[PDB]
Design a binder for this molecule. Structure first.
Ligand SMILES: NC(=O)c1ccc[n+]([C@@H]2O[C@H](COP(=O)([O-])OP(=O)(O)OC[C@H]3O[C@@H](n4cnc5c(N)ncnc54)[C@H](OP(=O)(O)O)[C@@H]3O)[C@@H](O)[C@H]2O)c1
Ligand SMILES: CN(Cc1cnc2nc(N)nc(N)c2n1)c1ccc(C(=O)N[C@@H](CCC(=O)O)C(=O)O)cc1
Length: 159
C-alpha cells in the first residue's frame, strides 16, 4: 500500500515559501519513525528543502526534469515513482502539495500531525473526506521547551 505522511497546522496549512512555518523536532522524530526502512516518494521542492538523502530509506524524487544528485533516484511519472519502489508492503509519500493531491486517491492510510497553531501558508492539504476514513489512532503532546506548540498525531485508514 501507499501512505501519506504529513504535518498540518490550522487550516490544513502545510507550509510557506518552500518551508514549514514551525519547528517540531518531535514530528521529525515521529516522521523518521514512520519512514525508516521504506521507500519515500517526494517532489522536487520538498526535496530541495530536505537537501540530502534520507538515511535508511529509498529516496525517490519527482521531477519532470533531470536528476541532480546521483545519490537519489529521480522520476518523471507517478507510475515511474511507484515502479521505482518495488515489492514493498508500504510506500511513503512525503509531499509536498501537488504530490499529495496526486496520490491521495491511491492512498489507504494517513499519518497526520495536527499542529495547534494558526499560521498563514501558501500550501494546503488535499481535502480528504471524513466518511471515507476511519481514525485508528491518536496521540497527544503538549508544547515544550523544544516543540513550541502542541500537536496530536493520528492515524487513519481508508474505510
Ligand atoms: N508539512 C508537511 O507535512 C510537509 C511534507 C512535505 C512537504 N512539505 C512542504 O510543502 C510545500 C512545497 O510543496 P509543493 O507542492 O510546492 O512542491 P512538491 O510537491 O514538493 O514539488 C513539486 C514538483 O514536483 C515535480 N512534479 C510533481 N509531480 C510530477 C509528476 N507527476 N511528474 C513530474 N514531475 C512532477 C515538479 O517539478 P519540476 O518541474 O521542477 O521538475 C513540481 O514542481 C513546502 O513548504 C514544504 O515544506 C510539507
Ligand atoms: C522539510 N522536510 C519535509 C518534511 C518534514 N516534516 C514532515 N513531517 C511529517 N509528519 N510528514 C512529512 N511529510 C514531513 N515532511 C524534512 C526535513 C527534514 C527531515 C529530516 O531531517 N529527517 C530526519 C529526522 C531527524 C533530523 O532532522 O535530524 C530523518 O532521519 O528522518 C525530514 C523531512
Amino acid at each position: 500500500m501507499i501512505s501519506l505522511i504529513a504535518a498540518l497546522a490550522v487550516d490544513r496549512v502545510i507550509g510557506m515559501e518552500n518551508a514549514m512555518p514551525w519547528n517540531l523536532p518531535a514530528d521529525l522524530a515521529w516522521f523518521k519513525r514512520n519512514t525508516l526502512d521504506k521507500p519515500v516518494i517526494m517532489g522536487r521542492h520538498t526535496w530541495e528543502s530536505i537537501g540530502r538523502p534520507l538515511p535508511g530509506r529509498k529516496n525517490i524524487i519527482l521531477s519532470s526534469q533531470p536528476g541532480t544528485d546521483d545519490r537519489v533516484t529521480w522520476v518523471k511519472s507517478v507510475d515511474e515513482a511507484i515502479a521505482a519502489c518495488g515489492d514493498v508492503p508500504e510506500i511513503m509519500v512525503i509531499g509536498g502539495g501537488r504530490v499529495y493531491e496526486q496520490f491521495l486517491p491511491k492512498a489507504q492510510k494517513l499519518y497526520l500531525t495536527h499542529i495547534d497553531a494558526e499560521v498563514e501558508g501558501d500550501t494546503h492539504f488535499p481535502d480528504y473526506e471524513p466518511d471515507d476514513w476511519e481514525s485508528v489512532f491518536s496521540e497527544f503532546h503538549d508544547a515544550d521547551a523544544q516543540n513550541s506548540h502542541s500537536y496530536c498525531f493520528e492515524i487513519l485508514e481508508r474505510r
